[PDB]
Symmetry: C2
Amino acid sequence: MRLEIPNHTERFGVVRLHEVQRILELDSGRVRDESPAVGLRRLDDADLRDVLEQTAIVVPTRNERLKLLEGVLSGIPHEALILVASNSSPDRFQMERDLLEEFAHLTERPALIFHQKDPALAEALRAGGYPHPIGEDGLVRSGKAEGMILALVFAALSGRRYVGFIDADNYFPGAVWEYVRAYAAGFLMAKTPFAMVRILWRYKPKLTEDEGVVFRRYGRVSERNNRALNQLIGGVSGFETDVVKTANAGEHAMSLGLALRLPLASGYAVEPQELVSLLELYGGVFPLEDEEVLQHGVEIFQIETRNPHLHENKGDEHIRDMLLACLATVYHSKLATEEVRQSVLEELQAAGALAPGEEPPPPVLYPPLSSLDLQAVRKALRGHFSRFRVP
Amino acid sequence: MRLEIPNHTERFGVVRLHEVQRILELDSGRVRDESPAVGLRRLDDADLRDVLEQTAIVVPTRNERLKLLEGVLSGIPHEALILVASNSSPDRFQMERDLLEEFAHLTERPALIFHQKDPALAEALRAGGYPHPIGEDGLVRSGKAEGMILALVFAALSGRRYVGFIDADNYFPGAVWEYVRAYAAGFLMAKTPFAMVRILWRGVVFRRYGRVSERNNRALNQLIGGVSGFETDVVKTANAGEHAMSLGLALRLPLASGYAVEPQELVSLLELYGGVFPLEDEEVLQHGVEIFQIETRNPHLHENKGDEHIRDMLLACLATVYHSKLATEEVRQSVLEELQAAGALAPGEEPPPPVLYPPLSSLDLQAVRKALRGHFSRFRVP
Ligand SMILES: [Zn+2]
Ligand SMILES: [Zn+2]
Ligand SMILES: [Zn+2]
Ligand SMILES: [Zn+2]
Ligand SMILES: [Zn+2]
């Protein structure tokens, strides 16, 4: 993989937020003659695969088409682990298990699969002193955040350093292959054990070009979200930026060391929160206690894939609460300067937030997973790793 | 790349058509030991790239969106030689050389690019005593067939062993990638210098298109079954535009001119090597021919309009069959019914016979290198 090298990079504390870098070439072969290009970077295949051997790839599902989900698997680079995180119909789950075993069997490759509403998992967490997501029904509640918590525990238990997430909603297994290598690309390029890789794919329309009156309005929001994020940064920085182009980077990857360090939000605020949290924690505008991070800093990679991201999902409550969740997390940052709060307030109640006079509900964040006793977890799950493990 | 073993295999003279193999895993990684569970074929990435290192990838273009074409190039594996075969409008073509020079520069890799209508390329073939594709205006005529001819020439000249074609129409570089790797996979499973790889992929108009194809592949299995005496289901890729093939095999095939190429390709393999005729090719008689049909994980989203475009695709195809010197009476017969049953015309009406170009072996490369001598560098892209 050849990548362009971000011409600019945003320094915010010990955070290093790099501009969007385009993938120039998907598979740039086996390097022998290095030629040193200053402007771009050629990732050697074998390096990429070595990173991927240390990577778990989480593929969440809640009653996704199987045909699609299986197609997503075929495309995942061989070296990566593969964890299917499930919240599907009791019996749909069963099919997914069957689907994964067959695949893993045939591809001679290891995999785990688990279910959000599994009670063992609920016990596992509270044994490790992290009861924070358990429902009243006595088990880990549904939610995006809740999913990741389970994902990161398995990543951890499995001994991988890197974990990244793929949307099973993808007609294109080749697109998946690129997205995963791009994570590897990111961690390769990275120079600190605290790293995040956030994929995007961005598209230019026009007056004489079709997109449907719903793909259009989807761009109109991410643009604003990214905006609201640079508004937050700029607010602290004093210098107006435009570096975040990935506020809603659902498909993202993150070194476990970084992952376990961040808090997490429940709704659509997740992706946007990640960023906010990183800046709150490592922006400098606060005492930062953590030695190793302050010492190596954080790099956030924003990589632009060659393949279109075509995931089937739309309508109001999607695209709308998409907006509300995000600008709420900004309004509430411990980093917001008054003008940032206000600028953001307006877009909300002047697009429905029931005014005048109204505030978004604050973020509801889980605490970092560093908290969680992993040994207690390993002890608490002894007699069940059979059933998570797919031979 | 892991893929399924083909269920069965049609032996026909020294030709063997393999049944479809589904790609199961996009990238199987690096083998260092084996439990090669013979259910499937696991293919090492080193071996794949070693093959790619001797493969030309032709990308034709006739006035293609440019973003669309860059995209495609980005998805070609590194080890492959990139051949852009243009017949675009004059300055669209200038944009093309530009686009490719910038690509190949930044990605540190060799490309070729030529324009079908270039006067030097006429001379070049003249000299090598293959004057056939040159037309009235003293230039090579437009057409799928003619494109390929020029493309095989460069492939040859540049000493690559395998040539594959790829459709610039693709919205997904990641698809391109799987495609080109698929080609390599075929050659790597090939147990013969002479091999073919054909890619396939299993809207009321798409329906009409799907149907037209079912019918095309049918006609091709009747042709086969007609000679062996036993019905075969094999051949699912009668119209497989995206195919690769080994140069040895390419320079040996005659070439039908337009919408008839891919089917004719199959027909000719059978006439020539299917053992019903005098076969003098010490090498082909002795290594034989493998045809691979590979089903890709990645869909094919080539925008292809015109309803009648597809009608043409049909007549095109049943024509090559009707006219094979291998069609029994009853094959010649069914095809016919079927045809005039939606076109062809009259109570009866013999579809036009195929205008074929003869094999490119009939050509003298060194004459050609001679003639292209002072020019190889407007074709070579630094
Ligand atoms: Zn810049
Ligand atoms: Zn995506
Ligand atoms: Zn069959
Ligand atoms: Zn021999
Ligand atoms: Zn295709």
